[PDB]
């Protein structure tokens, strides 16, 4: 189905680089950075390669973590592999090749803990496992037959808060919404609200308050707060702690949970859920992200 | 999609 | 690299919305926002369009700020129009047009104060004026023969601090960094360091005091600090004030300038240009923006 | 570039 992702990356980008380029990446490549590299095939050209190296000596030669290396003579292809103190390792090739001379094309690499997973076109193409610690890489190279118009770093990074947004669709039986974050370590509480954007009625109000580890839901409608529901089994919130809270939308109640436990529901007040477009969350978390399909 | 702990629903 | 760009953006994403699509932009399209369209032109295909749109009314129909209307039929076209009040605009014509059947795109719609800036497949495309105000639009729509794979809404967002970046590129004569900013209204002082990344020495030291309206400059060497220097002309900043400061290497001397004024200069002491790799920033602003080539 | 103020070198 369609779905949505929102969240804030600090971005770092090259434009124009001369190939043969050589380049020192800005920060660290943890688990979820992105690599954007944007170029085009020239028409007489046989291969090209992206290398993720660890430094950019020549005599004795880098370690190359991650040598992705596209080939274009026969059929076509992309040669992958590691070089380890001037040794190569065992060639991995990926013959489901998207690259064609005088063809643009846009490379993602996404890093993993354990793999780094390609992406060209927007279509999946190669996982490639690591076999040196990513964290060792600092250093970009591009060499070989190609034009790069770009290359851009995405570093993940805490959403600023107070958040606001309109749902591109509104609340509506089966919708969803995933608000993903980390609790404080000096954390109070905190608040997710469905609103009725045009009227500021709030449908759902989550307010987590960790003080006293109650959940407090309530709706605000007709300018004033109702009867607040706080009945849990336990308290699924810690100061420090990672979460994922997904809020379900069925006909008769929202339903919540958890970390994959279901923990309320909540039955519908506000009952024009169609009328429900806006998101707010605020208070003592880092949001990470939020999802909604 | 992006769920370390799971989806109950 | 020419020219590398570094900056934090709120991002909201739709993955495979259905067409037609009609949704609610997730929040306001102030100047820098940007709206990116990744899709494919079916083989049968004659016309789609993207609609930036006041609401979603169809009787009446809802005004169009922002019509976009790629057509096939012939050579190929685009065709941009305002609807307001139901009534079709002057029909804005561009013929130098990057749509193809069967062929991918990326549209990126940049929203500026007084007009609309569109590329596709990162090349220059068309302009068009405001006849609406750009406040008023809170819907996208998309409509006609084509497949949309994402719709991504880009938001400018404060970098968060203390902000550590490395370089691509290391300073050398004729490179330039450029930092854009807004001095805090609560503002005391802010620093922005120039380091030898490996041996962590500050190569040059900026900080503006505002509190005392000094604009210090050091090096930190031999793991000290040298002989500051304080001299100058004017103190270039104020509280709650957006400021451009540029810092230029040149043989002998950084110069630096605050907002397209030169302001001072500053003799290498760490002479070793080529091993000045790292930018670090830190205190009382908001960063906007780092720039460099 | 995105330069409102200009650039003096
Ligand atoms: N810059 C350098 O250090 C260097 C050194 C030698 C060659 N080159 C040339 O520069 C371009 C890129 O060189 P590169 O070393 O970065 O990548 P290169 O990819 O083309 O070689 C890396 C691949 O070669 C494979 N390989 C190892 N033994 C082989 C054999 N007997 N036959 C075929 N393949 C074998 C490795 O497994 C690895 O996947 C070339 O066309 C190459 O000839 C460069
Ligand atoms: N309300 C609607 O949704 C509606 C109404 C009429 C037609 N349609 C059809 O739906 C698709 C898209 O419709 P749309 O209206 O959003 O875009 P439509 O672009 O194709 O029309 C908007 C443009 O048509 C121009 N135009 C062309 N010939 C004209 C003429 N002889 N007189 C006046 N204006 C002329 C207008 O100037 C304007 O730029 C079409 O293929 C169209 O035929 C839709």
Chains 1, 3 share one sequence.
């Not at chain 1, 291969?47 to 991650?66: E, M």
Request: net charge positive; hydrophobic share 40%; glycine share 8%.
């Amino acid at each position: 189905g369609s779905m949505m992702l929102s969240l804030n990356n600090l971005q770092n980008i090259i434009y124009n680089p001369v190939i043969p380029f050589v380049g020192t990446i800005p920060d660290q490549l943890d688990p979820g950075t992105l690599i954007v590299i944007r170029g085009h095939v020239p028409s007489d050209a046989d291969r090209f390669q992206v290398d993720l190296q660890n430094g950019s000596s020549v005599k004795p030669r880098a370690d190359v973590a991650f040598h992705f290396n596209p080939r274009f003579k026969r059929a076509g292809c992309i040669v992958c592999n590691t070089l380890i103190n001037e040794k190569w390792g065992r060639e991995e090739i990926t013959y489901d090749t998207p690259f064609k001379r005088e063809k643009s094309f846009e490379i993602v690499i996404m890093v993993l803990k354990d793999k780094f997973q390609v992406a060209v076109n927007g279509k999946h193409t190669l996982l490639y496992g690591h076999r040196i610690g990513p964290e060792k890489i600092d250093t970009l190279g591009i060499y070989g037959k190609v034009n790069i118009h770009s290359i851009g770093f995405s570093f993940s990074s805490h959403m600023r808060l107070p958040f606001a947004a309109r749902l591109n669709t509104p609340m509506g039986p089966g919708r969803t919404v995933v608000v993903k974050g980390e609790v404080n370590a000096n954390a109070k509480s905190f608040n997710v609200d469905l609103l009725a954007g045009k009227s500021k009625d709030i449908a759902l109000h989550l307010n987590p308050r960790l003080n006293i580890k109650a959940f407090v839901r309530n709706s605000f409608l007709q300018e004033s707060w109702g009867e607040e529901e706080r009945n849990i089994t336990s308290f699924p919130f810690s100061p420090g702690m990672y979460f994922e809270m997904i809020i379900y939308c069925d006909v008769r109640e929202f339903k919540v949970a958890v970390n994959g436990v279901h923990s309320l529901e909540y039955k519908h007040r506000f009952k024009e859920l169609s009328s429900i477009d806006t998101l707010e969350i605020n208070g003592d978390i880092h949001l990470l992200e939020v999802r909604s399909w | 999609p992006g769920l370390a702990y799971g989806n109950p629903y």
